[PDB]
From Swiss-Prot, chain A:
<dbReference type="InterPro" id="IPR050263">
    <property type="entry name" value="Bact_Fimbrial_Adh_Pro"/>
</dbReference>
<comment type="similarity">
    <text>Belongs to the fimbrial protein family.</text>
</comment>
<dbReference type="GO" id="GO:0007638">
    <property type="term" value="P:mechanosensory behavior"/>
</dbReference>
<dbReference type="GO" id="GO:0009289">
    <property type="term" value="C:pilus"/>
</dbReference>
<protein>
    <recommendedName>
        <fullName>Protein FimF</fullName>
    </recommendedName>
</protein>
Curated annotation (Swiss-Prot), chain B:
<dbReference type="GO" id="GO:0009419">
    <property type="term" value="C:pilus tip"/>
</dbReference>
<comment type="function">
    <text>Involved in regulation of length and mediation of adhesion of type 1 fimbriae (but not necessary for the production of fimbriae). Involved in the integration of FimH in the fimbriae.</text>
</comment>
<dbReference type="GO" id="GO:0009289">
    <property type="term" value="C:pilus"/>
</dbReference>
<protein>
    <recommendedName>
        <fullName>Protein FimG</fullName>
    </recommendedName>
</protein>
<keyword id="KW-0732">Signal</keyword>
Curated annotation (Swiss-Prot), chain D:
<dbReference type="Pfam" id="PF09160">
    <property type="entry name" value="FimH_man-bind"/>
</dbReference>
<dbReference type="Pfam" id="PF00419">
    <property type="entry name" value="Fimbrial"/>
</dbReference>
<dbReference type="GO" id="GO:0033644">
    <property type="term" value="C:host cell membrane"/>
</dbReference>
<dbReference type="GO" id="GO:0009289">
    <property type="term" value="C:pilus"/>
</dbReference>
<dbReference type="InterPro" id="IPR050263">
    <property type="entry name" value="Bact_Fimbrial_Adh_Pro"/>
</dbReference>
Curated annotation (Swiss-Prot), chain E:
<comment type="function">
    <text>Required for the biogenesis of type 1 fimbriae. Binds and interact with FimH.</text>
</comment>
<dbReference type="Pfam" id="PF00345">
    <property type="entry name" value="PapD_N"/>
</dbReference>
<dbReference type="GO" id="GO:0030288">
    <property type="term" value="C:outer membrane-bounded periplasmic space"/>
</dbReference>
<protein>
    <recommendedName>
        <fullName>Chaperone protein FimC</fullName>
    </recommendedName>
</protein>
<dbReference type="InterPro" id="IPR016147">
    <property type="entry name" value="Pili_assmbl_chaperone_N"/>
</dbReference>
Length: 154, 144, 778, 279, 199
């Protein structure tokens, strides 16, 4: 104690590193050269796509999720594609959760649910999506679109 | 030699002056995101210590540490946050434990010396709690 | 799955891990699909394979069809051409750069070639009641100069008291990167590794540790195993998962994480994907002389001797040191000393037994020629035991003993000029001991002792300390005892002393803006067993905002023993100006009355001029952002820019990343940057610029149309007038800055169409932000 | 004629020849220094004063003994200073008394040093005395050598002045203590005198002797001296002036001296000779 | 692999801008950032200024974002104010599909010199144990961020209570008795469990 030594400080909180998954489409007129099926034509091999909910904070524990996109005209619960001459015709994209249940588009925050999290240790969302032949039939073309996920926090 | 005379003596070293007594550095506040892995640590930070005005013959001084370490051997935080330990070494990269000691030389001319030392912090187990941070260490000296 | 053998365009994986997509030729052979590719070693080294990790591969050709499943064990290839992949399973030892936090060294900086001064004057004046006044004058001097890697340093001083130069210290040095090492010419001192620290002038070539990822620094036991299939191993210690990873199949080893022998021992738990776990535990203690295996530490030292005694000689010499890590805890090491009247040779091994605590014994023999030409041989031996932490909070930190013959002496014992340093009473043996004990939660006791025997005289020098800490949660209880005793003199050398420290923040509002949270006091006492009981109170802390100036106040009282009672007094202020640092101290103790002053600083000869500022540490970054005036560099104390727009930081780690952050709130209303954060990896002794694109001028949002439309999104804009350039938001909006008041604008999105033009009224000047709307050319 | 003394009374060995064990008072004198009176010791008597009167003379060649044997003086035979070494035969002392009567011989010394002296141990040979006892009784001459040993170790003057003592040992108050050096010198006679120094120096200015520390050596500081402002170069004679019987001090003060640079703490030790000059 | 400074923002009165670090960690992928604030009604009206409002980021970078006023004191200074930061993250550049990511976080404009020190607010929420419901009344000028509602046994729902406000929530009757809960501090951390007082 002839000399004295001191450090002070705090910890700053940090959010979640969020990594996505881009899915190519390679179905290539299996569904559409065969069908010729009604506007409920969501016969399409779904893809489990993941969200890397890692790393995160600690008090980060339960949040609210949500999605925006161009609602298809026939079913607003389908994603319309990009308005392209090189595209297909008569399709709308259906989202499915990890339990394979169709997800409501553009729903307000009042209906949302607290996605409970694992503090510290990593998490990952593993969902599905498919193509629903709205018009009968579907002509060939490109399958291009964008969508948006927003998370409102804890 | 008509008469021969025997003259004797001894010189012993006295306390010098300090230059200071009052080291304190805050480092700002960061992320247990960035400190998530077990055994993650901070960035080092410099500290120099002088002691001046030394009596004649005084050549070497041992520095004698003191601090509150936990069972890691690294120093326990006294702030509210947890899982967090402290890291002082020399600039020869050698662990400065509580109670420990280190002798250095003294410059002949300037009657003084300095202490090139480095400090950072750490987690051991990773994923520390969030809160406040407090740390105080003491040091005495012996002379040579 | 399966296509017939032949050449395919296929996404090459490696345990599902994509590398590239090569046309690969297949043959009816041996895999999961009955087919083998013809791969080249040039492909595989371009794929992740350490080629020399598999022996027998250098003797192959460059492009011969690699028999990998046979030459390499636990190695499978599997094609899946339904998805066109090649899932490859390899034992991990055949890859590289698995050091977490690896840095490629070609990313390292040389720096600039530039000069350097570092000065300091200081001094005091004392008034004596008997004798009067006393005035002292010492200026310090540290220059340097760097060209690429040529690192030249000199220090010296000037003197005057109530009176001249003295040349002190100089060296030029340079590293070699593939040799991983550092050579220096000039003044130097040796290292206390096997032998003793020796000042000299010469050549000194040493392996540098500080290139390592620090996960390699320190010893860790290197862990071997073989995975059957893909597994995941968790590793624990003290109940904490100290390591986890999923692991591929195959033999493997572990060169991993920072060690802690006083964390207990290792809790290894190997979950193969079946669920079967391969459990054992791993011991760990350490010698401070250990090497992690594969490392090899060395130095090559030669030159002429330097001391500082007139009564000696300065001859030429040589000395060599070398160490290399070994299997099974064994440890070779060795250097030797080769000089004129003299030769000296060590012999080695130390070892960790793991279960029994680490231990080392070594022995050196030397040949000597005394200045009366009596020539002798001798031997010496040393013994060092370690035992780590037990469950009872107990650590054996060091056990040390050394012994030598009568005929054993040192090279330093020889160096002299005239004959008759009392060499008839060399030491026999030396004992030292280091153990503490964890005391529950809120206490700790430290225990140290050392012991020293001599040939000839019957006198032994000993040293002892016991130090105890208790903390009641603000309250710092300190109680320690000292006891040494010495041969050349008489008296039992002891002291007992105590302290409690108290802070002031722990009583007030933590968000009160009082400086009084940054203040504290303490009170201490002691007694000598010999009359003198003494005590001390001290109140100290920080000051105005940056705490660059700060205060210390104390006094104590002395009593007993000699009848020299007395009060004290010390008051000291230290300020750090941006140009350099300066303080004034004061003592009064009633006979003693004295006053303390001193100013340091550092000077930079660079290409853009000369920079002045605070003291220096060995590697400094230039801050280049012209136009800055008073710039808070974040987490940096006393660090601002000049009136020009430049600054420096001496603060440096190296071979490691460093981060440069700036306050916006300290900025002026008219200049902008793009990223206030920079990052470097420097080497040792270098110089970095911190360049930042400043934008001086007026700051402005506009919402612009053309063809009665907000023009399409994300287009590119430049100023014709200024250099500044912009990117179009929605609604025909773009923010820009660094601008003049009147002018013209070029905009490209298709083929460049739009050209706008403008003039704001000048009264829009006390506003940082202005807004308007207009149209284009096209 | 039985003789005796008080202190040693060493044996009449080989007839009337003998050793002796005597204490010493060698005295600085003008002309020739006193060494030893023998009437202080030697108490001879005629056992029969009635039958015989012993006629004891000394024959010549009775010299000093040991290293003393090369020297000259006088010898106060019956109080009469007859020249030394004995080159003639002296007259007789008659012995006709039962009283152990003193034997009147005192020894003198031709002084040749400055104020110097020769220290002699106990028991060593000091002188060789060829005496001769005839008698009135008959022609019983028997001639015999009285050899001189001591019972103590005494310094004899060889010069004509004298000091307090020849051996002073001091230790400083430690750093930066300096001591006045206590010693005074008188003479038998007013003599212009001087002195210089001796010992291995450190400085070329001859003002700093070295520390010849034996164990735990302090270094960097040697032996500086003064008289009262006066730093003394070695081997340079400072005068004294015409000094006689007054014991006068030399005004000296011993001092540290920073020889070189880095100062080694520890123990300090040096022994210094002085040399006295007839002026 | 993108992230922000933190979650929650105070704009104190008297301030000039607010700084906000945001960061991508990945060293190749490029992103475009839109930034806009809506009110507590979720309506974008440009009342506060985020610079740079639109940009891109390739490689492992960072940006500090400054936020300014554009209202000039037209707001009820008696209590704090909620707004919504809306942060659009765009992957930059074959039959594919991707997502954009928005951070919609709060904003608390704190005015100058309100009465109660905010720590002393967590004790001032009063209640009314009403039927299958609950009334939960804020007498104070603070937004109130409550969780861990354990009315005896049943772990219940999160709540925001307006400054000078209240809330009424649903109650399943198959619960325990005592209101036990935690809330959030001014630093995101959990305040301890407390006890509810109705009537």
């Amino acid at each position: 104690a002839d000399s004295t030594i001191t450090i002070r400080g705090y910890v700053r909180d940090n959010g979640c590193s969020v990594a996505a998954e881009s899915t190519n489409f390679t179905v290539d007129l299996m569904e559409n050269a065969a069908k010729q099926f009604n506007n409920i034509g969501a016969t399409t091999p779904v893809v489990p796509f993941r969200i890397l909910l890692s790393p995160c904070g600690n008090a980060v524990s339960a949040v609210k999720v949500g999605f925006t996109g161009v609602a298809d005209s026939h079913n607003a619960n389908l994603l319309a594609l990009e308005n392209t001459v090189s595209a297909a015709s008569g399709l709308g994209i259906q989202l499915l959760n990890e339990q394979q249940n169709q997800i409501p588009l553009n729903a307000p925050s009042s209906a949302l649910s607290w996605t409970t999290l694992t503090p510290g240790k990593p998490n990952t969302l593993n969902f599905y999506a498919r193509l629903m032949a709205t018009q009968v039939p579907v002509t060939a073309g490109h399958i291009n679109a964008t969508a948006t996920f927003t998370l409102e926090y804890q | 030699a008509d008469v021969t005379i025997t003259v004797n003596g001894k010189v012993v070293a006295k306390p010098c002056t300090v230059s200071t007594t009052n080291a304190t550095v805050d480092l700002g506040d960061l992320y247990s995101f960035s400190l998530m892995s077990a055994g993650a640590a901070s960035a080092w930070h410099d500290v120099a210590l002088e002691l001046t005005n030394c009596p004649v013959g005084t050549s070497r001084v041992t520095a004698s540490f003191s601090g509150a370490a936990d069972s890691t051997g690294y120093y326990k935080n006294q702030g509210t946050a947890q899982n967090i330990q402290l890291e002082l070494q020399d600039d020869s990269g050698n662990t400065l434990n509580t109670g420990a000691t280190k002798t250095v030389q003294v410059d002949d001319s300037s009657q003084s010396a300095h202490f090139p030392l480095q400090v950072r912090a750490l987690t051991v187990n990773g994923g520390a709690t969030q809160g406040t941070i407090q740390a105080v260490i003491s040091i005495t000296y012996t002379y040579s | 799955q399966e296509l017939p053998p032949g050449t395919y365009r296929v996404d090459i994986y490696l345990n599902n891990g994509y590398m590239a997509t090569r046309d690969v030729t297949f043959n009816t052979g041996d895999s999961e699909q009955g087919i083998v590719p013809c791969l080249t070693r040039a492909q595989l080294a371009s794929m992740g394979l350490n080629t020399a990790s598999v022996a027998g591969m250098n003797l192959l050709a460059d492009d011969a069809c690699v028999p990998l499943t046979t030459m390499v064990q636990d190695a499978t290839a599997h094609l899946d051409v339904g998805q066109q992949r090649l899932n490859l399973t390899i034992p991990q030892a055949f890859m590289s750069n698995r050091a977490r936090g690896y840095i490629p060294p070609e990313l390292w900086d040389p720096g600039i070639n530039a000069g350097l001064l570092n000065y300091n004057f200081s001094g005091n004046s004392v008034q004596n009641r008997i004798g009067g006044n006393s005035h002292y004058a010492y200026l310090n001097l540290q220059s340097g100069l760097n060209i690429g890697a040529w690192r030249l340093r000199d220090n010296t001083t000037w003197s005057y008291n109530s009176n001249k130069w003295q040349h002190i210290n100089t060296w030029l040095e340079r590293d070699i990167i593939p040799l991983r090492s550092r050579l220096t010419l000039g003044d130097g001192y040796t290292q206390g590794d096997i032998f003793d620290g020796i000042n000299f002038r010469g050549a000194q070539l040493a392996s540098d540790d500080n290139m390592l990822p620090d996960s390699q620094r320190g010893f860790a036991p290197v862990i071997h195993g073989i995975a059957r299939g893909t597994a995941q191993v968790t590793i624990k210690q003290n109940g904490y998962d100290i390591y986890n990873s999923t692991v591929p199949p195959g033999p493997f080893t572990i060169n991993d994480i920072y060690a802690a022998g006083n964390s207990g021992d290792l809790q290894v738990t190997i979950k193969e994907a079946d669920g079967s776990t391969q459990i054992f535990t791993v011991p760990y203690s350490s010698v401070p002389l250990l090497q992690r295996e594969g490392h090899t530490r060395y130095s090559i030292t030669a030159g002429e001797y330097r001391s500082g005694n007139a009564q000696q000689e300065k001859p030429r010499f040589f000395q060599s040191t070398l160490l290399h890590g070994l299997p099974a805890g064994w440890t070779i090491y060795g250097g030797t000393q080769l000089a004129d009247r003299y030769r000296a040779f060590n012999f080695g091994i130390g070892k960790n037994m793991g279960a029994l605590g680490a231990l080392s014994v070594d022995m050196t023999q030397a040949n000597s020629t005394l200045p009366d030409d009596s020539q002798h041989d001798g031997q010496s031996v040393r013994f060092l035991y370690n035992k780590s932490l037990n469950e009872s909070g107990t650590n054996i930190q060091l056990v040390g003993y050394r012994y030598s013959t009568s005929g054993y002496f040192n090279f330093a014992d020889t160096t002299y000029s005239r004959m008759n340093y009392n060499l008839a009473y060399n030491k026999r043996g030396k004992l030292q001991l280091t153990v503490t004990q964890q005391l529950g939660r809120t206490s700790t006791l430290y225990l140290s002792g050392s012991h020293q025997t001599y040939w000839g005289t019957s006198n032994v020098d000993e040293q002892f300390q016991a130090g105890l800490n208790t903390a009641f949660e603000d309250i710092n209880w300190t109680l320690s005892y000292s006891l040494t005793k010495n041969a050349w003199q008489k008296g039992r050398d002891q002291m007992l002393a105590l302290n409690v420290n108290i802070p002031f923040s722990h009583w007030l509002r933590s968000d009160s803006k009082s400086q009084w949270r940054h203040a504290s006091a303490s009170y201490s006492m002691s007694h000598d067993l010999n009359g003198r009981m003494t005590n001390l109170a001290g109140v100290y802390g920080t000051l105005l905002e940056d705490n660059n100036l700060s205060y210390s106040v104390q006094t104590g009282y002395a009593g007993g023993g000699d009848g020299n009672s007395g009060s004290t007094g010390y008051a000291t202020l230290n300020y750090r100006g941006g140009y350099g640092n300066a303080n004034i101290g004061y003592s009064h103790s009633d006979d003693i009355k004295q006053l303390y002053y001193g100013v340091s600083g550092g000077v930079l000869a660079h290409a853009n001029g000369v920079t002045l500022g605070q003291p220096l540490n060995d590697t400094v970054v230039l801050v280049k952002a012209p136009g800055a005036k008073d710039a808070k560099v974040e987490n940096q104390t006393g660090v601002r820019t000049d009136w020009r727009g430049y600054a420096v930081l001496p603060y440096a780690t190296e071979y490691r990343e460093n981060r440069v952050a700036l306050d916006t709130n300290t900025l002026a209303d008219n200049v902008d940057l793009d990223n206030a954060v920079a990052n470097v990896v420097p080497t040792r002794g270098a110089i970095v610029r911190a360049e930042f694109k400043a934008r001086v001028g007026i700051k402005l949002l506009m919402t612009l149309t053309h063809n009665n439309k907000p023009l399409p999104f994300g287009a590119m804009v430049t100023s014709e007038s200024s250099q500044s350039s912009g990117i179009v938001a929605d609604n025909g909006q773009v923010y820009l800055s660094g601008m003049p008041l009147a002018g013209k604008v070029q905009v490209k999105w298709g083929e460049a169409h739009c050209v706008a033009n403008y003039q704001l009224p000048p009264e829009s000047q006390q506003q940082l932000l202005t807004q308007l709307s207009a149209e284009c050319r096209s | 004629f039985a003789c005796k003394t008080a202190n040693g009374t060493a044996i009449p060995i080989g007839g009337g020849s003998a050793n002796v064990y005597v204490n010493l008072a060698p005295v600085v004198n003008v002309g020739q220094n006193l060494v030893v009176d023998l009437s202080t010791q030697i108490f001879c008597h005629n056992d029969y004063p009635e039958t015989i009167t012993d006629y004891v003379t000394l024959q010549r060649g009775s010299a000093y003994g040991g290293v003393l044997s090369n020297f000259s003086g006088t010898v106060k035979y019956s109080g009469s200073s007859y020249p030394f070494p004995t080159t003639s035969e002296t007259p007789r002392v008659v012995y006709n008394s039962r009283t152990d009567k003193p034997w009147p011989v005192a020894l003198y010394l031709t002084p040749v040093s400055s104020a110097g002296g020769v220290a002699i141990k106990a028991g060593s040979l000091i002188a060789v005395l060829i005496l001769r006892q005839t008698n009135n009784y008959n022609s019983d001459d028997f001639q015999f050598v009285w050899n001189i040993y001591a019972n103590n170790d005494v310094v004899v003057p060889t010069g004509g002045c004298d000091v307090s003592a020849r051996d002073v040992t001091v230790t400083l108050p430690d750093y930066p203590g300096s001591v006045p050096i206590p010693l005074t010198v008188y003479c038998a006679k007013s003599q212009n005198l001087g002195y210089y120094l001796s010992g291995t120096t450190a400085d070329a200015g001859n003002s700093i002797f070295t520390n010849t520390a034996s164990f735990s050596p302090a270094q960097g500081v040697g032996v500086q001296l003064t008289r009262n402002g006066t730093i003394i170069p070695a081997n340079n004679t400072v005068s004294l002036g015409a000094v006689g019987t007054s014991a006068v001090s030399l005004g000296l003060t011993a001092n540290y001296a920073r020889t070189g640079g880095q100062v080694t703490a520890g123990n300090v030790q040096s022994i210094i000779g002085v040399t006295f000059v007839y002026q | 692999g993108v992230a922000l400074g933190a979650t929650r923002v105070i704009y104190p009165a008297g301030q000039k801008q607010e700084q906000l670090a945001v960061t991508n960690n990945d060293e190749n992928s490029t992103y475009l950032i839109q930034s806009w604030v809506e009110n507590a009604d979720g309506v974008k009206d440009g009342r506060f200024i985020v610079t740079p409002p639109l940009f891109a980021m390739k490689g492992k970078k960072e940006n500090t974002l400054r936020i300014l006023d554009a209202t000039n004191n037209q707001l009820p200074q008696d209590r704090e104010s909620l707004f919504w930061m809306n942060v659009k993250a765009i992957p930059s550049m074959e039959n594919t599909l991707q997502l954009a990511i928005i951070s919609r976080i709060k904003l608390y404009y704190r005015p100058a010199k309100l009465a109660l020190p905010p720590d002393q607010a967590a004790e001032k929420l009063r209640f009314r144990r009403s039927a299958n419901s609950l009334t939960l009344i804020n007498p104070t000028p603070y937004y109130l961020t409550v969780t861990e509602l354990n009315a005896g046994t049943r772990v219940l729902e999160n709540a925001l209570v307006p400054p000078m406000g209240e809330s009424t929530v649903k109650l399943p009757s198959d619960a325990g008795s005592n209101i036990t809960y935690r809330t959030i501090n001014d630093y995101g951390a959990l305040t301890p469990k407390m006890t509810g007082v109705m009537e």
